[PDB]
Swiss-Prot record, chain A:
Enzyme class name: isomerase
Enzymatic reactions: L-rhamnopyranose = L-rhamnulose
Signal peptide: none
Annotated GO CC locations: cytoplasm
Record-given protein name: L-rhamnose isomerase
EC number per UniProt: 5.3.1.14
Function (record text): Catalyzes the interconversion of L-rhamnose and L-rhamnulose.
Family: Belongs to the rhamnose isomerase family.
Residues that span the membrane, as ranges: none
Cofactor: Mn(2+)
């Protein structure tokens, strides 16, 4: 039933010179960096209402991730934060975290053939209680966070060295003001100076890459954030670093897809966090939505699968967490698949020659092409459940393991 | 014991030297846009009453606006305002001589001039692609136009001994969703690299580049995006120009000023009121305008941000337009000058978010009007609404005998 259909679906695409065999081959190898903090609702293991069954233990969260990976087709990566340090039960200050403290994570990734990405954690800490960190007026506080981002950079280096795949160490900070600033310049000056110091030492790009990440506002962070779109975009260009863009972190109607093509004109590499904003930076699970499709179109038309590091960042505590990961990851795969299966060549020519009629027409007609058939075949070949059947595998794990914790 | 005197003591209690503020305001120049006067007509080759028909009317109109506006200012000129003297000159063939009358008039009144190539309403722009066009001929024509405009800027600054700012804005984009966002942008980057090839001394010319998010006939996609230009300018030591009408809903240019001063020496901005699209309304004394002035003043950037105006309301008196809109940006500056930055920074630095709010808020009822008026006296222009009289007189005898 499944194959003969895919055989028919395959010729529909092939009449456009769309080699689906090739696209499946290319799709098999794009890695998706998934975020750990969905496992335990940003808990972490720092020594000191919502859906049931969250992880509360390193061993619990590692099993959770294994579960989700098994329902997600392909080879992927896991995206770690510093509070996921396993300090062996002895409190270690964030400025003092070391490769030692992520030893097991690495061993575990080796075992499962996963790349590891990293983040310094700059929130939920006494030294960030004032809402400022890298940009706090106090030197002693800035230094602590400088040092910690540096400790973080070394850990990033460690992952790449251990796993033979570069690790991306992304810096995100919450620094801002809830209410109206009487000075927008001084805190940002302090951010540049904190970053200059954080980036002082060269690390081989074969092991670690640095990324900076903007946001327009947070809760308690509404009138102004220090690390803004214009700052980091400038900062990154100046210092040959990576801009990390988060589909939830911009203005209303503001779109990350429109930004990809300009970015690659000036940066060789680009970093992506895909999450679903529902009116604020809310972190709903990624849906196979228009903007998502569009992002995918950009990544593909622009021969950018090797240049756009794709990560996920969402946190929904109201539904099953393993379903969160698998719903959200499959969706970004689906989208890549979809953009793989568009006749870019003819669409380009039509644009080129002002045939806006064919362009609109066929882009639209492609929305009813037989995607499910390919996507379903791809899942069969990739030893993951085929449609909603991964739901059954989640019900077992919820019954047998999750509800039991 | 005159309003001004009393007002001066009120600001005085806060350390604010109002005299100093008035003296530094006196110096700051605003670049008034020309196309307000003849409704973006221009003089090339071929609905409130009495717009300008000719450069002679247009200059005379500008003179009247300036006399109603305190301070010494400038005129932002567009390539289509070329005085071609009865010949038709193709845009890629414009030269200084084409603007001498303009320049000679500027110097007589002690004005600076800014410039812009014109990359719209022309046979070779009819496709909504220009510098990004898929055809080399088209692209070259417009490249050549920009280069020329750069030379004309150069002629400007040499003559008026104040650098001319030549800004590139182009309408390049697509009406419906595009099937490629990159190659057009690659084309634009190549074309700009070719425009900017010849070095020009920064004492006579400065180059800016301007983004829009969307326009009529191009709602889906603009080649020259915010991120495209932010980058380009950074890599090539050029100025960004920010228009307050060219960004997303709720997105403010004031939040951008400070991030940019950290990474470029200068920055231009064009103020216009967007009312739900890039609509070019007369700038009003509003929150976002206060917030812009605030940033410019607090950040020690009065010599770093080149303030221009860019607005076109054909429905109201065209002179009153310039004069409302320009008096507005100056009032904004003044109010930003009469604020306790040092006390307010110390409170933010300290944590005392309470006073920061209270006083930001209290200073909104301070007597700005009494300073504004005294200033307008010293500067010799009509106070309050008196300027309407002069407008009305002028409309009667010149405007409405055309
Ligand atoms: Mn993020
Ligand atoms: Mn987020
Ligand atoms: Mn403009
Ligand atoms: Mn405009």
């Amino acid at each position: 039933s499944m194959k003969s259909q895919f055989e028919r679906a395959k010729i529909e695409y092939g009449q456009w010179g769309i080699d689906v065999e090739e696209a499946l081959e290319r799709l098999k190898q794009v890695p998706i960096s998934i975020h750990c903090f969905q496992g335990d609702d940003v808990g972490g293991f720092e020594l000191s209402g919502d859906y049931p069954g969250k992880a509360t233990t390193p061993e619990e969260l590692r099993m959770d991730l294994e579960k989700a990976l098994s329902l997600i087709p392909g080879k992927h990566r896991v995206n770690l934060h510093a509070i996921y340090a396993e300090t062996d039960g002895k409190v270690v200050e964030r400025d003092q975290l070391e490769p030692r403290h992520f030893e097991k994570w690495v061993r575990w990734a080796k075992r499962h053939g996963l790349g590891l990405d990293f983040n310094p954690t700059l929130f939920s800490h006494e030294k960030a209680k004032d809402g400022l960190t890298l940009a706090h007026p106090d030197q002693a506080i800035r230094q602590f966070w400088i040092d910690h981002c540096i400790a973080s950079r070394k850990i990033g280096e460690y992952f790449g060295k251990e796993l033979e795949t570069p690790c991306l160490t992304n810096i995100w900070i919450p620094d801002g003001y809830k209410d109206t600033p009487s000075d927008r310049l001084t805190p940002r000056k302090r951010l540049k100076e904190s970053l200059d110091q954080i980036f002082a030492a060269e690390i081989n790009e074969a092991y670690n890459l640095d990324a900076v990440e903007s946001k327009l506002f947070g809760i308690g962070s509404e009138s102004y954030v220090v690390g803004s779109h214009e700052f980091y975009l400038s900062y990154a260009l100046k210092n040959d670093k990576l801009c990390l863009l988060d589909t939830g972190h911009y203005h209303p109607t503001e779109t990350v897809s429109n930004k990809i093509s300009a970015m690659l004109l000036f940066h060789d590499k680009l970093a992506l966090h895909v999450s679903r904003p529902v009116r604020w930076d809310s972190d709903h699970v990624v849906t196979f939505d228009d903007e998502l499709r569009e992002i995918a179109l950009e990544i593909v038309r622009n021969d950018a699968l090797d240049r756009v590091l794709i990560g996920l960042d969402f946190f929904d505590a109201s539904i099953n967490r393993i379903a969160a990961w698998t719903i959200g990851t499959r969706n970004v795969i689906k989208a890549l698949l979809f953009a793989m299966l568009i006749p870019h060549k003819q669409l380009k020519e039509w644009q080129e020659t002002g045939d806006y009629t064919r362009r609109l027409a066929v882009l639209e007609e492609f929305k009813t092409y037989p995607l499910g058939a390919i996507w379903n075949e791809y899942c069969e070949r990739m030893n993951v459940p085929i449609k909603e059947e991964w739901l059954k595998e989640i019900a077992i794990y919820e019954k047998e393991v999750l509800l039991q914790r």
